[PDB]
C-alpha cells in the first residue's frame, strides 16, 4: 500500500489534470471538496505539489506537472513519509534483520519501478 | 511500506528459523519477548503462521516453514490486511481513478515480485 498523503497529492494533481479549457474556477476549496478531504490536508498536498513544481498558484498544473514520472513523484512524496513515519519504528535486534531491510527496500524499488514509466496524463487518459 | 502484522509474522518465523540444534525452549512467550511485542499480537502471528503451515506447534518451523517463497508468504499475510484495512478506504469518484488503481496493484505486484525469489533461510543466512 501507499501513503495517505502520497495518495492525497496524487488524487489532487490528477483532478487538476482534468480541466484544461476555460472550464471553471478551481482553487484549494474546490479541490479539497472534489477529492473528498478536509481543506487542512489538501493545502498540505497542494503546497508540497507547488514545492515540487507541478502546481502553479495563481490553481492549475504546470508543464512539469504533466510530463513527470509518477514513480519519481511518489518517491518524492512518500520519501518524506519514510522519514517522518519510519522514525517511530525502532525495531529490536533480530538475527538477519538488516538482510531483510535490504530486501524490503528492493521490493519497494520494484513497486516504484513499475510506476516510473507513466505520467499523470496516462492516469487521466481517454483512448 | 508493509503491514505491521505482516512484519510481525516475518520477524517471528525469522526468529524461529534461528535456533536449529537443541539450543533452548522456545514458545510464544519467548518469541513475544524476542521480537519485542506484546503476547497478544505474537499469538496472532504464531497462529496465522500455523494456519499457513510454517509453524508446527508442540514451537519450531516446519520444512514448509523453511522452503517457502517470502513474496508469496507476504501476499498471504498482507492480503488479509488488504481485505480488512482497505475496506475502510471508501475513496470518492475521481476521473481516471480505476486506471490508477490498476497501476497501484501492478507496482504492488512488482514489490512482491522482488520478494518471490527468496526464502526465510536466505534472510537468516551466513556465508
Author numbering:
A (entry chain A), B (entry chain A): 2 to 59, 66 to 134
Please quote the authors directly.
The most widespread dedicated NO sensor regulator in bacteria is NsrR, a member of the Rrf2 superfamily of homodimeric transcriptional regulators. NsrR proteins from Bacillus subtilis (Bs) and Streptomyces coelicolor (Sc) have been shown to bind a [4Fe–4S] cluster, which functions as the NO sensing module. In ScNsrR, reaction with NO was shown to result in loss of the iron–sulfur (Fe–S) cluster and formation of iron-nitrosyl species. This process led to loss of high affinity DNA-binding and activation of genes that were previously repressed by [4Fe–4S] (holo-)ScNsrR, including those encoding Hmp-type NO detoxifying enzymes.
We also present the structure of a three-Cys-to-Ala (3CA) apo ScNsrR variant at 3.9 Å resolution. In spite of these limitations and because there were five ScNsrR monomers per asymmetric unit, we were able to solve its structure thereby gaining precious information about cluster-dependent DNA-binding modulation. Indeed, a comparison of the structures of wild-type holo and 3CA apo-ScNsrR shows that the [4Fe–4S] cluster conditions the conformation of two relevant regions. One of them is the C93EGDNPC99 sequence that forms a well-defined turn in the holo structure, but is less ordered in the apo structure where it adopts a different conformation; based on the superposition of the holo structure with that of the apo-IscR-DNA complex, the tip of this turn should contact the DNA backbone of the ScNsrR-binding site. Furthermore, Asn97 from the C93EGDNPC99 turn forms a H-bond with the carbonyl oxygen of Gly37, a residue situated in a turn next to the N terminus of the DNA recognition helix (RH). In the apo structure this interaction is no longer possible. In the apo structure the salt bridge between Asp8 and Arg12 appears to be preserved but the absence of the cluster changes the orientation of these residues causing the break of the H-bond between Arg12 and the carbonyl oxygen of Val36. The disruption of the Asn97-Gly37 and Arg12-Val36 H-bonds in apo-ScNsrR, indicated by the different conformation of the main chain in the medium-resolution apo structure, results in the displacement of the RH by over 2 Å, which may be enough to prevent its binding to DNA, as observed. The 3CA-ScNsrR apo structure shows that the conformation of the C93EGDNPC99 loop depends on the presence or absence of the Fe–S cluster. The other major determinant of the α3 RH orientation is Arg12 which, along with Asp8, significantly changes its position after cluster loss.
